[PDB]
């Protein structure tokens, strides 16, 4: 029912051993060197 100006799909593949790192405030190899998320991030993460 809501409406936003733009949405961005950020598509990638990760290791299982890094999966919890797709979130604000995470660290590690991937979270620090591969995919960092903003602290004021607004959106939703999907994975399978």
């Amino acid at each position: 029912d809501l409406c936003f100006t733009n949405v961005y799909a950020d598509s990638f593949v990760i290791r299982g051993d890094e999966v919890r790192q797709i979130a604000p405030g995470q660290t590690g190899k991937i979270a620090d060197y591969n995919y960092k998320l903003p602290d004021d991030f607004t959106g939703c993460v999907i994975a399978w």
């Epitope: 919890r20 790192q21 979130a23 995470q26 590690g28």
Partner: antibody
Framework: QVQLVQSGAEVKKPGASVKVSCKAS????????MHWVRQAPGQGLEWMGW????????NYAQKFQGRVTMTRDTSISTAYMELSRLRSDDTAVYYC??????????????????????WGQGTTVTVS | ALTQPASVSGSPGQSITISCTGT?????????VSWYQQHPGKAPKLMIY???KRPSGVSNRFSGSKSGNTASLTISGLQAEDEADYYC??????????FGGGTKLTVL
């Protein structure tokens, strides 16, 4: 500056009961549900129950339902846990434990999250 | 209630992983898995909480991961001080959050 002190070592006979105290300071006492854990000498941990110092809410493990009883005194900020019908395998070290956050976590999860402050020691030995 | 290896060995500088397998009803439906470290004769210390969030003061070398029904502790840059027992924790349906065997970490 969170300080936690327990009672001393205790020895009991099989079939008797044991009463341990848990006196805290340096924080809001009723704002933290007090959890309890026991550990046999040389074995792993075993959680037993938790008490709410506010409104006196309590809930025990289904492993110990009917044998363990808690009360608390907010006037001196102390918890008290009693084990009844003691047997041989209850010789162990016992701690209380302070839960991590405040009970204002609308979606947080308290007081089921975890334990950041662990207490010193209470050893209960039950031998004939 | 959870199963984790009893003892795993590693080398200094290595990144080591510790597994802990549960079920779909306790670890597979809740993002509430943790890792505790305890030294011999010492008080346990919460290293990893709420999946991979860390209390203030814990080193960044300890991270967490969750896959299906499996929890994983990761340690980057293994050191001599890392020798201790590690327990995985997860809500199981009642009271409540107990550890496991006690993955004893040793350094070669």
């Amino acid at each position: 500056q969170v300080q936690l002190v327990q009672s001393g070592a205790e020895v009991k006979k099989p079939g008797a009961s044991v009463k341990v105290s848990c006196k805290a300071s340096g924080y809001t006492f009723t704002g933290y549900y007090m959890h309890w854990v026991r550990q046999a000498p040389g074995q792993g941990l075993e959680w037993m129950g938790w008490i709410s110092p506010v409104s006196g809410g309590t809930n025990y493990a289904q492993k110990f339902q009917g044998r363990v009883t808690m009360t608390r005194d907010t006037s001196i900020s102390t918890a008290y846990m009693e084990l009844s019908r003691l047997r041989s395998d209850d010789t162990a070290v016992y701690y209380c434990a302070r839960a991590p956050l405040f009970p204002t976590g609308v979606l947080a999860g308290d007081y089921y999250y975890y334990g950041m402050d662990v207490w010193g020691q209470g050893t209960t030995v039950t031998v004939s | 209630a959870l199963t984790q290896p009893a003892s795993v060995s590693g080398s200094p500088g290595q990144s080591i992983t510790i597994s802990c397998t549960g079920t779909s009803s306790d670890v597979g439906s809740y993002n509430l898995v943790s890792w505790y470290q305890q030294h011999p004769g010492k008080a346990p210390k919460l290293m990893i909480y709420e999946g991979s969030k860390r209390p203030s003061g814990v080193s960044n070398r300890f991270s967490g991961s969750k896959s299906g029904n499996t929890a994983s502790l990761t340690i980057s840059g293994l050191q001599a001080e890392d020798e201790a027992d590690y327990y995985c924790c997860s809500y199981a349906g009642s009271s409540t959050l107990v550890f496991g065997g006690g993955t004893k970490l040793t350094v070669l």
